[PDB]
Subunit: 412 residues, 2 copies
């Protein structure tokens, strides 16, 4: 029968910091993590900025010898996973190793590594492709490497659902624990798509903000002058744990995961429906899964990507689900500060939702100078808002019309 699931550990790399507390300080201070990209020459690209992880030292986590073999998305995923496991206090033993699994996902995975090995192949020949190309690039290897390093013998898998990946990974890992397939899961996502193919590929679709001359103001969810998403790098990991398991070991519990929804739009490969029908269906599924009155929802961490169609679809979805209560909750997009971590977005935003519950504060939507037509909810413009938050909801939507909602609440 269905068991309860709590959050006992969190870890993060973001454009605002190399761990959770540092990232969260930047979130509450309204700081932007967005800057011109330094790691490559983007003069031929229409977008030349994004949210880089600054000053990451992989030798805080792994030997230089093994790090050299791994794409940055794997390095970031392992860093966030190690932080979350350490933060949990959990001890892996022969007695519990078969009951601890991992589900760390990615939207695109090791695009930097694949681009670099493609360069080798085309300029030199296949004899210059790294022997570590496959295990160092494919998406499941965050889960794989984490399991090898910590001895986790529970369910070992990875989701790839584009910009919904982090939310789906956390939700499905919670279901694993709920249904008794595991007692503990490390779950979240990681992304590092800032290579030529990433910036060039989103750029060819004209999906990215082109505000090169003012990167910190580029990400402006629900602002009338928004012109697309800002591409960002990093990782989020959570340690999810069965309630009675967490209670038995005296774990510090941050919050309870009470609800998870998934819905397909079945609308369009890349565009969200204007009325937010898929996001509404997904949130309704998550609220019914959590056994909630929608009026219990105090805070929504929006997907809020700073796209014309995405941002207004989300307002439509929230008004349709919450009716008059839409005017009482607070909804914000931390992508205003972090940009869009793609497969990692739902993972870092799940952590931000849990911290909104811990600290009783709604993170701001920075850059919301001129709210667009119909964008008339409390979107927490400019400044963090202290308020009562018993229930927080984190939304993600992605290519393929794939939707996820997580519902968290305070645990006493």
């Amino acid at each position: 029968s269905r068991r309860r699931v709590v959050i006992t550990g969190m870890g993060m790399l973001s454009p605002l910091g190399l761990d959770v507390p540092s990232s969260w300080e930047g979130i509450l201070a309204g700081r932007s993590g967005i800057a011109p990209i330094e790691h490559m020459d983007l003069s031929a690209y229409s977008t030349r900025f994004g949210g880089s992880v600054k000053g990451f030292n992989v030798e805080e986590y792994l030997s230089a010898k093994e790090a050299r073999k791994l794409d940055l998305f794997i390095q970031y995923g392992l860093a966030a996973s190690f932080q979350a496991v350490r933060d949990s206090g959990l001890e892996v033993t022969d007695a519990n190793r078969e009951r601890i699994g991992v589900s760390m996902g990615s939207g695109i995975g090791g695009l930097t590594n694949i681009e670099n090995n493609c360069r080798s192949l085309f300029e030199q020949g296949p004899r210059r492709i790294s022997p570590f190309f496959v295990p160092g690039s494919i998406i499941n290897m965050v889960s794989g490497f984490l399991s090898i390093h910590l001895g986790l013998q529970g369910p070992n898998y990875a989701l790839t659902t584009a910009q919904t990946t982090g939310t789906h990974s956390i939700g499905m890992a919670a279901r694993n624990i709920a249904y008794g397939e595991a007692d503990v899961m490390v779950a979240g996502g990681s992304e590092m798509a800032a290579c030529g193919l990433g910036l060039g590929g989103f750029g060819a679709a004209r999906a990215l903000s082109t505000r090169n001359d003012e990167p910190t103001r580029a990400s402006r969810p629900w602002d009338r002058d928004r012109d697309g998403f800002v591409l960002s790098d990093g990782s989020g990991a959570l340690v999810l744990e069965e309630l009675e398991h967490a209670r038995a070991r005296g774990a510090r519990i941050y919050a309870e995961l009470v609800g998870f929804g998934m819905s397909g739009d079945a609308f369009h490969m890349t565009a969200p429906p204007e009325d937010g029908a898929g996001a509404a269906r997904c949130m309704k599924n998550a609220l019914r899964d959590a056994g909630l009155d929608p009026r219990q929802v105090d805070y929504i961490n929006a997907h809020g990507t700073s796209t014309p169609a995405g941002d207004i679809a989300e307002i439509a979805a929230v008004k349709s689900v919450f009716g008059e209560h839409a005017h009482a909750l607070s909804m914000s997009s931390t992508k205003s500060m972090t940009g869009h971590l793609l497969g990692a977005a739902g993972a870092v935003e799940a952590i931000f939702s849990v911290l909104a519950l811990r600290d009783q504060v709604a993170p701001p939507t920075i850059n919301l100078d001129n709210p667009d037509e119909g964008c008339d909810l409390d979107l927490v413009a400019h400044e963090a808002k202290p308020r009562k938050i018993d229930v927080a909801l984190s939304n993600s939507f992605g290519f393929g019309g794939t939707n996820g909602t997580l519902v968290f609440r305070r645990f006493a």
Copy 2:
């Protein structure tokens, strides 16, 4: 408690055929799908052969214009998915579309597309990258495109667990139905990694057979002269359906999916443990899930990749799990004929496991001329073996030590 899950539709592209009955005819005849790779210069490569899909016509499924937007692995996954839904006779309606979902995965995803866009990027610069590069290359676009085309609003996701993808995709879709999150799922996997990057990436790790002189004899699981796996392309999809739902509409039921196991080895990034400890835990997990004694298993579709370490690990795991029953079951590798479809391997082998139940016949392991030391199980050498089969297992083991087992049972 838990609902029962049955298989009501199947679809396939493989090196043996453009559908299930053609592929299965090849399997029972001991035919090889392996041949030198055409329309591609492999001069500088140590492997020049594999399992190609021959004569695939995407315009049976999609307009030329929609097919141009999508990597071959997505085309393949859609073809298998459309076949499986057709084969099921399911009528999608406003009354059931929120109860029908998709989980089609891939191990490596859009390497061919990435390769072609890399070529453009390096030669001409980022303005030649396709606008459809991202949505046409990401692994969740089989689930995304299928849901949009058929109007499916149930759970929409994609697994990526390397060579375990197809097995995990089917098992987790079965859990969705068992626990009431969907009534129908389309599940399986697709792969097309016969590009410079795939053949070069696996070749760089010396993982591939280099028997260029005799491609049809290269894949020789448990044979003392095996020298690595054969890379193959294609797709498998199954329609999974809640039993009462299948019975109410008068569905043709092929078999019941009674068990699913997952385990991590936590051993090595690419190598299995020699004693097959992870595969043994995974099979025991799947049998416990099914409420079956190891003695009830009649047929195992092995991972059986033709690698020195992997093939011997699987013998060890089977001897360990099945004890005095280990010789009574038949265990065969259909990869002897199909080669290794990586993320689709588990999907097409689940289909072969189901057809073994329908037709009461164990597929052969072809090329098993000289069983290796300790390879003394009933490996169905050379020729198909008619036999009693009530319970069939399908095993997948992949990079990151990720394991999957599906247990299928005759249904009447």
